[PDB]
From a paper:
One example of siderophore piracy is the uptake of ferrioxamine B, a hydroxamate siderophore produced by many Streptomyces species, by the specific OM transporter [name]. [name] belongs to the family of TBDTs (transducers) and is involved in ferrioxamine B transport as well as modulation of transcriptional cascades in the bacterial cell. Here, we determined several crystal structures of [name] from [name], in the apo state as well as in complex with the siderophore ferrioxamine B and [name]. Our results indicate that the transporter can exist in several different conformations, and that both substrate- and [name]-binding is required to form a translocation-competent state of the [name] transporter in a two-step [name]-binding mechanism necessary for transport function.
In order understand the mechanism of complex formation between [name] and [name] we determined the crystal structure of the ternary complex consisting of [name] bound to ferrioxamine B and the C-terminal [name] domain (residues 251-340, referred to hereafter as TonBCt). Two complexes were present in the asymmetric unit, with crystal contacts generated through the exposed soluble regions of both proteins. We could resolve almost an entire [name] molecule including the signalling domain (residues 53-820, with 11 amino acids missing from the N-terminus after the signal peptide) as well as the full TonBCt. Similar to the FhuA and BtuB-[name] complexes the primary interaction site between [name] and TonBCt occurs through β-augmentation with parallel strands forming between residues 332-337 of [name] and residues 142-146 of [name]. In addition to the observed β-augmentation, the unstructured polypeptide segment upstream of the [name] box (residues 135-141) forms complementary contacts with the surface of [name] molecule mediated by backbone H-bond interactions as well as side-chains Leu137, Met139 and Val142 located in a small cavity on the surface of [name]. The secondary point of contact involves the side chains of residues in the periplasmic loops and barrel interior of [name] with several residues in the loops of [name] facing the barrel. These contacts are mediated by electrostatic forces between TonBR271 and FoxAD352, and between TonBR266 and FoxAD355 as well as a side-chain (FoxAE316) to the backbone carbonyl (TonBS300) via a hydrogen bond. In our crystal structure, the [name] fragment is located almost perpendicular to the β-barrel and the membrane plane highlighting the potentially dynamic nature of TBDR-[name] complexes, which has been suggested by recent EPR experiments. However, when ligand-loaded, [name] association with TonBCt leads to the closure of the extracellular loops, shielding the bound siderophore inside the barrel. The inward movement of loop 8, which is seen in the ternary complex with TonBCt, places Lys657 into close proximity of the bound ferrioxamine B with its ε-amino group protruding towards the hydroxamate groups coordinating Fe3+ on the opposite side of His374.
Author numbering:
A (entry chain B): 53 to 130, 135 to 149, 155 to 820
B (entry chain A): 53 to 149, 155 to 820
C (entry chain D), D (entry chain E): 251 to 340
Write the structure that this text describes.
Amino acid sequence: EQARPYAIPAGQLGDVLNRFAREAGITLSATPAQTGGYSSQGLRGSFTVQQGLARLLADTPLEAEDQGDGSFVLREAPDVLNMQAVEVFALGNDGYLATHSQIATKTSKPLLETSQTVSVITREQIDDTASKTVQQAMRYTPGIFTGQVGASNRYDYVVMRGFADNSVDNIYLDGLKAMGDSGTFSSMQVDPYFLERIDVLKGPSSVLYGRSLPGGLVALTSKKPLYEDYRQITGSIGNMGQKEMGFDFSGPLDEEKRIAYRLIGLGKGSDTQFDHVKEERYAIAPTLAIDFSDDTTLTLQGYLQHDPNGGYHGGVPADGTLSHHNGRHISREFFDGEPSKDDFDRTQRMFGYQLEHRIDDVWSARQNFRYLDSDVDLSQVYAYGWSASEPNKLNRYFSGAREHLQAYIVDNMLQAEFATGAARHTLLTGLDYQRRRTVVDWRSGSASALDAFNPVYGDDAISYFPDDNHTRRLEQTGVYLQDLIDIDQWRFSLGLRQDWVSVTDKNRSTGSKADDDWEKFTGRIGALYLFDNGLAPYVSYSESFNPNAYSDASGTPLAPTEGKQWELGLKFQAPGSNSFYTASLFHITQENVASKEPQDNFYTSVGEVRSQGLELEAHTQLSDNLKLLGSYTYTDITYTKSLDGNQGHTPNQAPKHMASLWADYAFDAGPLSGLSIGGGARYVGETWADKENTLRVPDYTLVDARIGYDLGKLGLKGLDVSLNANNLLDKDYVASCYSLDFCYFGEKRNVTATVNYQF
Amino acid sequence: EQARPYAIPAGQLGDVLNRFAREAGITLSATPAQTGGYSSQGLRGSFTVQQGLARLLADTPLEAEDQGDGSFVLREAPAKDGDVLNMQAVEVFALGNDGYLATHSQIATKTSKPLLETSQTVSVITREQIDDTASKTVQQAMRYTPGIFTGQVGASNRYDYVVMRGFADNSVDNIYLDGLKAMGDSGTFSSMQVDPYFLERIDVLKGPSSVLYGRSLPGGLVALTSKKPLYEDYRQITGSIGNMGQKEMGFDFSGPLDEEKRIAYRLIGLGKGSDTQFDHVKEERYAIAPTLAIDFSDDTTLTLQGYLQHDPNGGYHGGVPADGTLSHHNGRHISREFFDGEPSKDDFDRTQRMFGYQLEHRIDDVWSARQNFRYLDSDVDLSQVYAYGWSASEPNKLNRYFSGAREHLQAYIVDNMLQAEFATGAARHTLLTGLDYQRRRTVVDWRSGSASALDAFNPVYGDDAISYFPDDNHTRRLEQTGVYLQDLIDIDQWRFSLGLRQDWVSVTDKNRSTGSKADDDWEKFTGRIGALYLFDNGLAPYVSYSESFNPNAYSDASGTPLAPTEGKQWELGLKFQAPGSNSFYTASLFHITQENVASKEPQDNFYTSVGEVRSQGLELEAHTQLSDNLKLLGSYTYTDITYTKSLDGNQGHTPNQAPKHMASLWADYAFDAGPLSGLSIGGGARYVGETWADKENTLRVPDYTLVDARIGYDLGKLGLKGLDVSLNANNLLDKDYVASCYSLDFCYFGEKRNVTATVNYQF
Amino acid sequence: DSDIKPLRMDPPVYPRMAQARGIEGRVKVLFTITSDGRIDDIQVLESVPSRMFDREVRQAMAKWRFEPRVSGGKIVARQATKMFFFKIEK
Amino acid sequence: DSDIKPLRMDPPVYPRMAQARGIEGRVKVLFTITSDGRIDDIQVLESVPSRMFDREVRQAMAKWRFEPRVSGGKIVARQATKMFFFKIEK
């Protein structure tokens, strides 16, 4: 009859009706259908049961009736009606796996339906494996050989399918070639800290991507701006005086969220494993997205980067590493150069933009542009073989360079997506232009010999040979066309390109200018089949055309490198599992290859080299916690046309066998929640040291490990810590050789500890 | 245009549409509203998006739009002719139906009222409390409750001695089970014990509660409320291993019996053992307890209950002189493991057997009937050699005597209650009349003697020779009938309370050995009045005046029977609970006078009335919910009790085994932090003041503080779901102490440290 | 032209002795939505616990009211199926 | 003698390049359900992030259809408010 006094908060009316029901001692029988969207109020003392109910659903069209035993039920009732609110959700869109790439095809398409061998390395991987360079991030990816100059981090060397020549000019950044001049020292590096993905296209890709080599390309993916406030600060301290600090802010600027920025920045250093050596870098990448109308969006991007120190990039004889020299080994520290005259100062300035426009439901244009301005300074003394007179001192030579580069590149794509009743087409047409001017001033000379065990530094004296200064220009323009036809369980890929190129080099100190032009049609025919299995076999016949900017020792310049690949392949994703397997079997034949030998200032061209093999690739997310990754490569490569004397022989720094497993367990329950333990092994087969097949660089297995803990669980949210060890077993080993006087050590144990703060 | 293969399992169509939108790489906008009661049974084939979406939503009235690449929306198509329409399901929820606290008592008022509105001091001990505090008997479970002194015979677990507001005489028959008195016979050895494994709650009614629960003492009573059957299958297996030979498995299955769920059972079982702190003693029990409830129409339910218990071994029940425990006897102490008796001529074999029903029938909108019935049958067997002061010739030896018994008990009790809930304008009523009735018949074959003397430290056992007196055989009858009437009137912010009772009792005792008999009849009118004022605030003072009437079947040294004990109590009170808040505070102030308390010294087979005793004091109780994981219990008890008529030259003195001051705190907090989810640490300390040792107040027993501790961990989180474990320890600091003394010749040790590692398994 | 459009379909009330002894369960029920707008020919296909919730589900459905099915030009009956779940909150 | 009774109240489509960027939001809206039984005079009261979802919401509402409100036996227009919440799964 009489009332009670209540004290009740607010919130989705359901709850408030519940608290009330409990506290009144009644029973409300009601459905989430009817209390649903409502969300409200509160109760503020001094009501009968009924009038409380009335006053609770006062602002709604509900009302509760009945009696007899405090059995009530909700119903309906009669200014302004408050309808239930609605929650509309976007249904639609993983760990070390990506099933999807835009890069392979210039259009978004799952890997299951794409007729070319492709790997993707994710952020998560890069950070779990502690890969500190682009080169290192591929240490777990098949058909790629890492250790090519061993421990040196000055350049990203990437050996595709046993093709280890021409291996630095291979990296594309948001689908535009880097634009360094691999014919000089002015080659560019990108830091992992700025990446989302690395996509690796094994085998010819010249049709979409302009100066591609026939073994493939590596494609880096810049990490664009987010549309809600994200802020991350990171810090990392490790051995070899490793010290790194970065930040990665992003967000939207306006209230309509049609503009957003991203600002990634880092500085870091390392004393390496080599004596008197420094690696040191600072970089900043602002990015700005701005939507114009509702179908045209603009992204302005920069990447300023300055390496005032260039780590070590040198090598020593196999006679003293693979073999005992007298009775001694050259240390896997060991420096071969005067610290007074050792200088590497690269500076990369990159501005560009990404312009997307929508035209119909059919058509769409895209324009990607980037301007490069760089500056490299070199002083470097180096060890080439043993002294003819002092028997434990290496002879040494000098190479110094001031070189300024500027280059730009651009890519216009027009993309019509239609149907022909039966089929579905996704047709691409483009025009791409690049040009690059490198002005170099180089000097060589000879230097003092140095004890290979117990060196004494000082004697930065150099007897300079006369200066070699040059001005290299290259311009290239291509037109391309690519239809991706899709009928039933079949997918076909057709592709055609027509490159025109022009390359010069006025030898400013002689006079000699060479000046040449080349032209070439290229293309891609490729068909696939998708069984209800989840099983997708395919063939591909692919070509590549890569114009080259180098010279002979005979003076005359090298012709473009050519490529023909047949590949038979099998992809398998069991109907939406969290797994993917690929098995690829290939046959590339490059004509005119282009080696160096690191003692000459000149290239040798080849005449055909042939490669063939097998790649098995596996990613499997065997549970909600454990993730797994593994590969086996088998490579069979041979100089099939050369006059070095080695026709019929096998190239050096190309292992037949390679294998890698990696695993990461992450506990998500119990005592040990937030803990992650991860590891892997890497195996490189035997390689040769020389192209005469004389001497073998022995095989090696590396172990890598990882402990990691989210301190969110303890209490400090957005905060974690991780401890990494790469080459856990501190192996002392020769990774590879370029020649019998130039063998390189592997990176000794790299321990690193990291602290992270997110948002 | 073209199809890919999918494999999506089944579930609340939302999910299954999500997995799909994902694997096709379209997007699809929908709302819970529209994907509500739809079940899905999902794709496994090769399909074309549209076709897959279509297939997915084929059993519903939904359809998916498209609108160009990706996109897709759930509109409601028309109308898919097919055949049958599958309407959205619906969930209909019932609304409004923590731990150590309970804000309602069904026992206090014989009808369910909140405690804030009940005008008498009631404490509640929950099942959870019992299990956290590792309380192994009823007596023990009240160790943290205020009012109540637990240490009456110390470590003895043969009986439940429960001293309420310092009235420690006559303290065994304080126990009611499912609202009917125990029906033991406090006059013999045949006094029943209830295992806490079979209980849900213990509600403590302090002060005179005779009106509603006949033949109760002025101290009040302790009310056991047993587990009843559940209408959802629930299964449980308990295992426990502990020190002092402690061993225990038990099970608890409850569930429904038919598919219409008009019937449910509850089978509870239990086997336990312990070789106690004391030399050569055992404590062994087995019991089964089947409960079964059957609804007769929509108006009626009948519950059948059984409780069969065997205690083949009786634990320890004995004491030793104050000289040698509170003093030093010819320079040493008697240990806390000292034996006393003689094995092979010391046993207590008890068998308890209880059958009964509870009939509940709703007569109409206003009126209702409840009928509670219990039959009890019992068989106690006793031999007990025991110690009684120091030998007059050998100096370090204790004099010893013998008490043997054979007792068949048989009793039944019933309580009929008729209840009317009506209104009188502003007056809200809950009027209740009853009539209740108990018959009890105890046939006892007692036997008694003098044993050998025993060295109190280094005893040599094996002289179980006994010189007997004549056997003493009696047959003891008690019959009691009550008519009672209780209205609870509730106007505006007042809650009145008004009770009226008329007991009629009759007690006979044929001494079958003498032939001679003591037939006696008594009557008394008892009542209470209680006014409580409740503030919107949460706060409620109250005053209570209440009366007690308790027939005694005991005899003098000469045999002249003892008169009933009577009691009057004025209580002033203050309960407070903030609206919403999970804390509850009470302060209670009381003055109780009893007439004719029946005392009894161990050595004796007789009782003595005591002209009058009075207790006045204060009780502060506080349960708080300090956070989401921390919970608390705390209490203070001030008790000033005194013999105010006595013709033994102890008039003015204070009764022994009654402590003036006792307080206790207990907390337990339980994590959900990632590192430690399901882990719980809990503990408490318990303080007891000085006690007297002496009706003549010559010695005093020191005070004592005891610590208790527990760790608990749900092994369900660590993967093994349902399983959980638990380690407790009672008297963690392993105090060696005398808990109370009955007299100068009988002082008892408190339990030593009791470690108990326990395992569980749910459903 | 159209289908069933609900106009009154208030839900049913949990049984008294079901909340008490928190019970829970379900009813599945096949029925007809007459040309005349009202519910008819109710058939219960599932009842857990047996025949417990049925009588409210029936009594609630009594009251229900719909715009009936249109099948190009004559109004038509409709056979339907619906599931009631009964639940307890906390 | 009656109220609004909705007959087609199909929800708005999550706008693309909004869900691409994973943006959630909300619109509150005040409107009229005319004698006609259709929606009219759509006034958008809250809109977070400003002007993002509004278009989709207006478009959806303009397809909605109701039994209009009846009051003392004459078809009558009626004022109403609704909230929409745009969210992204998982």
